[PDB]
Design a protein around this nucleic acid. Structure first.
Ligand SMILES: [Mg+2]
Ligand SMILES: [Mg+2]
Ligand SMILES: [Mg+2]
Ligand SMILES: [Mg+2]
Ligand SMILES: [Mg+2]
Ligand SMILES: [Mg+2]
Lengths: 225, 7, 238, 235, 240, 7, 8
RNA sequence: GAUAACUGAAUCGAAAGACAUUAUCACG
RNA sequence: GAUAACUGAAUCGAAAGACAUUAUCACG
């Protein structure tokens, strides 16, 4: 399966730019979670939840270190598919990790916090939860685009949420994830669509950072240095 | 209950 | 990087056998978790924990459905004459399998921490008994199975020299960094021999298969001992 | 050993008035605690503390039922025109009332500690949630009411010379022992004058009644402010 | 309501023997609780609970100091009379002290044996600093008998009143009167009739038989308190 | 405290 | 734990 | 860094003795 | 009144069967 498409001299840099988006998404979480984990030290009832978040922040930090230390030029005539495949695979692994963490962080933990404490100073803002979901949805769709546009898809690369939306549709009759992805016909066409994707995701990552700062500020105003 | 002979 | 090594007609089947080990690991968890998730429906204090597990079991059941519906022969071009040098390289074929193993293993690491550590403590704190905790022996089996799947995945990758930062496992890198700052040797720190042909990979896979199957059976046995406990200590009527 | 002092026809009513103060103190707590105990149902981490409060509210509600159903005239033998080989001495009549005050005061001392100190801290350690805590002012009113009921009880007992080790209150003895190893400013250390007739007791009781009613109203006010606080925050 | 009954020369001593039973019950708790309060000083999560127990052990220690310094002969006028004190006048303050103590123990027993036991387990995830089941049984058994003894002192002399009622006795009466009132076969300990005594001799004799029973219970309580102190030492206290 | 006229 | 010819 | 202070006499230590100049905790 | 709803197929029941028309909780 795939393209026929070969790498060019500008491929190494394209890959570094894609990986940098992922590093930025990971880091953004790591910074807000370090903060939260610190405020939770003070709450005796949240001790085991705190340790679950620690376990998550370590995985994120490991993925971020792995991405940051990857030298893409080392692994690059190679077909363009051969080069994008490990990057797409890293995206998929990260996205599935975020799906799990997002559920724990924005849903069950939010409810557990209210059940334990009734303390809404300890919860996320509604807007941070929207920015969380919105950022995830776009990284899902970006990953779907990288994979489907080059026809390198497989069962092993499917994302849970994309397949859920397909199976849900096939037993009903438009949804973000259900829209068709056009095959790209050259690297130039991929280069260009990547760049337009880069612009969109960078916008979402900034909205996410903003909401994370609003929440960090909230916890700081209420709980202190 | 241990009650005395005849309380 | 890698081998030079080409696919043979027996490659498709080797891949199905590897995938089947992963399916069996996934299913073994899915089965015990469906049980636990059912007992927990009746404990009001464990409601949100129950939903976190449901989120995990879904991710496992998705990985297992994906693996089970994957047709490996679809993604393999053998040529027709041992060479055909437009034949897929063995690396090209193992790479996605190894990548699936890595994704799974990392998921299991997250779930294992929640299931065997924090949740075990939270259960005790919330219910004041041991009726719905895991047995010590199930936790040992959990860790022992994980360790072996970590090492198997390490072996698949390093033996063919297809390793990269993107395929590193957190636990293997942790053991390496931990050793380099300390610097009966650690299972993950031992050197993996490059394989020199598919025949050599085939045969080591089969020996690995026998070991992992042993571990998966021990895991299943402890999963039944624990399901029986939950039934006797919580499930059944008094 | 006491007074030579006999009961009069107005004694029965004096006793009911004293008992009514205690019923009002007890009820005031029972009402604010029912409320708190209801808000705590929603907080999973405070379940065992909730039960401990329930145990205290029950003891109070029992003391309050016992006081309300006590018919003081039943236990009082006035004579005819002051028949003495039947007339009860005033001491005989006050003693069980003073004893009830002492028991109640000691119970309040234990509950006040739990409620205003260790539980307040436990609540902050568990939840960081200050909507769940008492107001500072309610705590001041709690202490101020206790101090005055302590002193009132000390007065009933010492003024008639019916005191004994068995009727001493922990906090009064603590202040005496503390003073003897340090005339004086302390509330509980001040001398109590013997009364010389029932008339003099009657008059001082009435003045005490005014003061304690008064403290009870300040307490009810602060209890309403705190009930309102919980209601505004929790529903 | 009471007795016609006058004090005798042996009354002072009878009262000291009753008070000594109360001092021994109080002291027994004070000793185990000093120990528990010492261990808890080393558990960070039980800091506030530790203070609540301190507040209780002070109350007990106060009651015990009061009882130990009370000289009963001071408050008793035997004659040679009718200056003679009535037996009721003399027992009443003793009974009243028993009632106060008993209600205090009820509150403490609930805290110590129920809510705190649970809190401990929830906070520490082990049983190193819980009570043994047998200590809890001895706790309840001792309280029940001191309740009944106090009921007997009061009802046998007809000096009862609303103000002297114990919560747990009234509970069992009110519960019976809306559950049955199986008032003959009567398994409930507190629901059995108390016969009026007709003289001091009869009180003296029944006191002594009560004394033997309570002393038994206090020794079983002390036994179980040593077993539990030993446990805390072995499970928590000592080094490894 | 508040202690009435003459206590 | 690990079969012959995997490690050294 | 944080936590912990009876109106105690326990606690720890085989003993000597220790007990805020201390003890404990921690993605330190 | 409150709580509990997998993208499940377990769970409970000797069985028939039950599973929001349900189950559970609650200060004598
Ligand atoms: Mg949760
Ligand atoms: Mg947890
Ligand atoms: Mg507390
Ligand atoms: Mg408690
Ligand atoms: Mg001191
Ligand atoms: Mg003292």
């Amino acid at each position: 399966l795939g393209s026929d498409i070969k790498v060019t001299p500008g491929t190494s840099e394209l890959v570094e730019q894609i990986l940098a988006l992922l590093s930025r998404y990971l880091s953004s979480y790591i910074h807000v979670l370090n903060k939260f984990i610190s405020h939770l030290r003070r709450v005796a009832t949240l001790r085991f939840e705190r340790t679950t978040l620690i376990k998550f922040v370590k995985k994120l930090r490991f993925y971020n270190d792995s991405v940051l230390s990857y030298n893409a030029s080392e692994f690059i005539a190679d077909s363009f598919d051969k080069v994008i495949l490990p990057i797409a695979s890293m995206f998929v692994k990260s996205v599935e990790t975020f799906d799990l963490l997002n559920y724990y962080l924005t849903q069950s933990l939010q409810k557990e916090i209210l059940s334990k404490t009734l303390n809404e100073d300890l919860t996320l803002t509604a807007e941070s939860i929207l920015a969380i979901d919105d950022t995830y949805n776009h990284f899902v769709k970006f990953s779907q685009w990288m994979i489907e546009s080059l026809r390198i898809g497989s069962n092993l690369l499917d994302l849970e949420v994309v397949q859920f939306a397909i199976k849900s549709a096939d037993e009903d009759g438009d949804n973000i994830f259900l829209q068709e992805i056009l095959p790209v016909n050259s690297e130039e066409e991929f280069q260009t669509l990547s760049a337009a994707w880069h612009s969109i995701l960078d916008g979402k990552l900034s909205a996410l950072d903003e909401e994370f700062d609003v929440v960090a500020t909230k916890w700081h105003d209420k709980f202190g240095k | 209950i241990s009650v005395p002979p005849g309380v």
